[PDB]
Amino acid sequence: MLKQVEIFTDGSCLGNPGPGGYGAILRYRGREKTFSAGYTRTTNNRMELMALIVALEALKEHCEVILSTDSQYVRQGITQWIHNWKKRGWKTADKKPVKNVDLWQRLDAALGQHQIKWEWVKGHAGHPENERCDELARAAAMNPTLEDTGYQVEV
């Protein structure tokens, strides 16, 4: 068995907003789980956040996790935004709530249960697991069955 949980994510959506989906692969206790759902009206970025939320929330105890994703949005948030957002109570400089605050807070909550390591892969230089997530995400976008109830046009 792997001594470190493994998660791989991608999200897909054309249209801002539009029908969108996500794929996520979770290696956890000898099992490999695959998550995927499509949403009727959403954004690419909200789908990349959702992928990670769903796969992390699958974890039922404290873990060491390696998260592999090619999202620039997730990468910026993690490496540039979240720390300064927290200090300002999840507001931008103009004192408004940050975009996708609902999903960022939910992701943050999940991140805070685990020892976390990030692998920022490129899209064309992805692993078999990342490619399969891309496939799942586009297939989910094609067949949406959920509501992205947190999505707002005005941020």
Side-chain angles (χ1 to χ4, degrees), residues 95-113:
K95 286 300 174 152
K96 285 148 99 27
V98 312
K99 214 219 294 118
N100 299 333
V101 72
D102 63 316
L103 298 190
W104 278 113
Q105 291 187 155
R106 189 177 178 184
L107 175 57
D108 183 54
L111 290 175
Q113 287 300 298

Side-chain angles (χ1 to χ4, degrees), residues 20-23 35-39 47 136-137 140-141 143-146:
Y22 71 78
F35 301 91
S36 195
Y39 295 74
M47 291 296 95
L136 290 157
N143 179 210
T145 77
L146 303 69

Side-chain angles (χ1 to χ4, degrees), residues 1-121:
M1 187 167 305
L2 280 156
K3 297 309 300 196
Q4 178 181 52
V5 175
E6 289 184 353
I7 287 168
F8 300 92
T9 52
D10 198 10
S12 190
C13 184
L14 75 78
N16 186 41
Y22 71 78
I25 292 165
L26 164 71
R27 299 214 247 276
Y28 176 57
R29 173 116 283 222
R31 305 158 180 188
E32 193 177 62
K33 301 178 179 228
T34 298
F35 301 91
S36 195
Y39 295 74
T40 61
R41 198 164 156 269
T42 191
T43 65
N44 178 83
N45 302 165
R46 293 182 60 75
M47 291 296 95
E48 307 185 312
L49 289 183
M50 190 77 68
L52 295 152
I53 283 154
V54 173
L56 283 159
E57 288 187 350
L59 298 182
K60 293 298 296 191
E61 57 272 348
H62 297 135
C63 289
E64 310 165 19
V65 183
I66 177 159
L67 299 163
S68 175
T69 182
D70 77 340
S71 175
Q72 170 181 238
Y73 178 78
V74 178
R75 174 180 183 187
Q76 282 189 276
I78 287 308
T79 62
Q80 301 168 357
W81 300 342
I82 277 181
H83 191 76
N84 285 294
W85 282 347
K86 282 196 190 168
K87 279 211 190 282
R88 305 181 319 179
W90 295 95
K91 290 163 171 151
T92 47
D94 52 10
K95 286 300 174 152
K96 285 148 99 27
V98 312
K99 214 219 294 118
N100 299 333
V101 72
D102 63 316
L103 298 190
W104 278 113
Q105 291 187 155
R106 189 177 178 184
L107 175 57
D108 183 54
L111 290 175
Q113 287 300 298
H114 306 286
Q115 294 171 74
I116 301 282
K117 175 166 33 153
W118 288 98
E119 179 194 69
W120 307 121
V121 296

